[PDB]
Amino acid sequence: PNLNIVLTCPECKVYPPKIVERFSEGDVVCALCGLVLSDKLVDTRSEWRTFNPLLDGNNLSTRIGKGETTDMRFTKELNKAQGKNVMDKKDNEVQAAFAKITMLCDAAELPKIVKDCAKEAYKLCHDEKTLKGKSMESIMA
Amino acid sequence: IKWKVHQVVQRLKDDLDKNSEPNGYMCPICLTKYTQLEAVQLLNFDRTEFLCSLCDEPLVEDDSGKKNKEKQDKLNRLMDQIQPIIDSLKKIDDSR
Amino acid sequence: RLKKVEEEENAATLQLGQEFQLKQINHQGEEEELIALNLSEARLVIKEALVERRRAFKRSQKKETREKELESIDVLLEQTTGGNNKDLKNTMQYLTNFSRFRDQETVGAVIQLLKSTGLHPFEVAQLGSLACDTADEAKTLIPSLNNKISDDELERILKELSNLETLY
Amino acid sequence: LKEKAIPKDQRATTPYMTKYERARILGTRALQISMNAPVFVDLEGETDPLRIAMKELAEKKIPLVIRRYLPDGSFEDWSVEELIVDL
Amino acid sequence: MFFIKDLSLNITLHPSFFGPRMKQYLKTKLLEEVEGSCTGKFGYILCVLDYDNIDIQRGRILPTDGSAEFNVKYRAVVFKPFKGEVVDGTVVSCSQHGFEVQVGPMKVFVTKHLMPQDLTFNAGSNPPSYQSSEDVITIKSRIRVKIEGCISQVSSIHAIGSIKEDYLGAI
Ligand SMILES: [Zn+2]
Q: Give buried/exposed letters for B20-54 (b at 16+ CB in 10 A, else e).
A: eebbbbbbeeeeeebebeebbebeeeeeeebbbee
E43 Ramachandran zone, left/alpha/beta (phi>0; psi -120 to 50): left
Q: For strands E158-162 and E85-95, give the pairing.
A: unpaired
For chain D, the residue count is 87
- 3-state SS string for chain A: CCCCCCCCCCCCCCCCCCEEEECCCCEEEECCCCCEEECCCCCCCHHHHHCCHHHHCCCCCCCCCCCCCCCHHHHHHHHHHCCCCCCCCCHHHHHHHHHHHHHHHHHCCCCHHHHHHHHHHHHHCCCCCCCCCCCCCCCCC
3-state SS, residue E9 = strand
Task: Work out the angle at residue E167's Cα, subtended by the Cα atoms of residues E165 and E169, and round it to the nearest 5 degrees.
Answer: 75
What's the number of CA atoms in the CB half-sphere (13 Å) around residue E23? 11
List all chains that touch chain E, counting a touch as 3 or more CB pairs closer than 8 Å.
Answer: B, C, D
CB B52 within 8 A of CB B58: yes
The type of residue at D31 is L
Which CATH number applies to E85-171? 2.40.50.140
CB D54 within 8 A of CB D60: no
Task: Work out the angle at residue C96's Cα, subtended by the Cα atoms of residues C91 and C100, and round it to the nearest 5 degrees.
Answer: 125
Domain with CATH 3.30.1490.120 in chain E: 1-84
DSSP 8-class letter at E74: E
Task: Work out the angle at residue A90's Cα, subtended by the Cα atoms of residues A85 and A92, and round it to the nearest 5 degrees.
Answer: 60
Contacts of D32 in chain E (CB under 8 A): 15, 18, 66
B69 and B90 share one domain: yes
Which is it for the CA torsion A79, A83, A89, A94, positive or negative? positive
* Cβ count within 10 A of residue C112: 10
CA–CA gap between residue C123 and residue E113 (Å, rounded)? 32
CB E73 within 8 A of CB E50: no
What's the gap in Å between A16 CA and the centre of ligand 1? 11
Q: Give whole-number Cα distances, E149 to A22, A106, E106, E157, E159, in Å.
A: 56, 78, 12, 11, 6
CA–CA gap between residue B39 and residue B21 (Å, rounded)? 15
Q: Give whole-number Cα distances, E88 to A93, C25, E5, E85, E105, in Å.
A: 78, 35, 25, 10, 14
For chains C and E, having 3+ Cβ pairs within 8 Å is answered: yes
Q: Tell me which residue of C70, C71, C94 sits closest to E140, measured CA to CA.
A: C94
* φ/ψ of residue B47, rounded to 5: 60, 30
Is the previous residue joined to E20 through a cis bond, with omega within 30 degrees of 0?
no
Terminal alpha carbon distance of chain C: 51
CA–CA gap between residue A106 and residue A115 (Å, rounded)? 8
3-state SS, residue C20 = coil
CA–CA gap between residue E171 and residue E157 (Å, rounded)? 27
B58 and B85 share one domain: no
Domain with CATH 1.20.1250.40 in chain C: 37-61+65-168
Q: Which domain holds residue B87?
A: 1-20+65-96
**Experimentally determined by:** cryo-EM
B41 vs chain E: nearest CA distance in angstroms?
7
Closest chain C residue to the Cα of E72, Cα to Cα: C27
Closest chain D residue to the Cα of E61, Cα to Cα: D28
CB E157 within 8 A of CB E122: no
Contacts of D34 in chain E (CB under 8 A): 66
CA A128 to centroid of chain Cα atoms: 25
CB D41 within 8 A of CB D61: yes
CB-nearest to C88 from E3, E5, E36 is: E36
CA–CA gap between residue A114 and residue A102 (Å, rounded)? 10
Q: Tell me which residue of D2, D3, D4 sits closest to D70, measured CA to CA.
A: D4
CB E6 within 8 A of CB E54: no
CA–CA gap between residue E15 and residue E120 (Å, rounded)? 64
Q: Give chain D's domains with CATH numbers.
A: 1-87 (3.90.940.10)
For chains E and A, having 3+ Cβ pairs within 8 Å is answered: no
CA–CA gap between residue E60 and residue D28 (Å, rounded)? 12
Q: E61, D34: Cβ pair inside 8 Å?
A: no
Residues in contact with C27: Cβ distance below 8 Å, sequence separation at least 6, in sequence order: E6, E8, E73
What kind of architecture, by CATH, is found in domain C37-61+65-168? Up-down Bundle (1.20)
Q: E3, C35: Cβ pair inside 8 Å?
A: yes
CA–CA gap between residue A131 and residue A133 (Å, rounded)? 6
What's the number of CA atoms in the CB half-sphere (13 Å) around residue A63? 5
Q: E158, B41: Cβ pair inside 8 Å?
A: yes
Q: Is D35 on the interface with E (CB under 8 A)?
A: yes
What kind of architecture, by CATH, is found in domain E1-84? 2-Layer Sandwich (3.30)
For chains C and B, having 3+ Cβ pairs within 8 Å is answered: no
CA–CA gap between residue A136 and residue A133 (Å, rounded)? 6
CA–CA gap between residue A93 and residue A77 (Å, rounded)? 23
Domain with CATH 2.40.50.140 in chain E: 85-171
B59 and B31 share one domain: yes
User: Taking the CA atoms of chain E, what radius of gyration do you get in angstroms?
Assistant: 22
Annotated binding site of A for Zn(2+): 9, 12, 30, 33
Closest chain B residue to the Cα of E157, Cα to Cα: B41
Alpha helices for C21-85 (secondary structure H) = 39-62, 66-80
Q: Tell me which residue of C104, C106, C122, C116 sits closest to C11, measured CA to CA.
A: C122
Q: Which DSSP string corresponds to B22-72? A: ---EEETTTTEEE-HHHHHTTB-TTSSSB--TTT----B--S-TTHHHHHH
Residues in contact with C12: Cβ distance below 8 Å, sequence separation at least 6, in sequence order: C122, C126, C142, C143, C144, C145, E84, E85
* Cβ count within 10 A of residue E16: 14
3-state SS, residue D69 = strand
Q: At what angle do helices C39-62 and C66-80 cross, to 10 degrees?
A: 50
The type of residue at A114 is V
User: Taking the CA atoms of chain C, what radius of gyration do you get in angstroms?
Assistant: 19
Q: Tell me which residue of E6, E38, E49 sits closest to C34, measured CA to CA.
A: E6
Long-range pairs for D34-37 at CB < 8 Å and ≥24 separation?
D34/E66, D35/E14, D35/E15, D35/E16, D35/E66, D36/E16, D37/E15, D37/E16, D37/E18, D37/E66
CB E155 within 8 A of CB E161: no
Beta-sheet strands, E only, within E24-157: 37-39, 43-49, 60-61, 68-79, 85-95, 98-102, 108-109, 143-151
CB E85 within 8 A of CB E7: no
CA–CA gap between residue A70 and residue A122 (Å, rounded)? 38
| Number of domains comprising chain B | 2
CA–CA gap between residue E148 and residue B65 (Å, rounded)? 22
CB-nearest to E111 from B22, B41, B47 is: B22
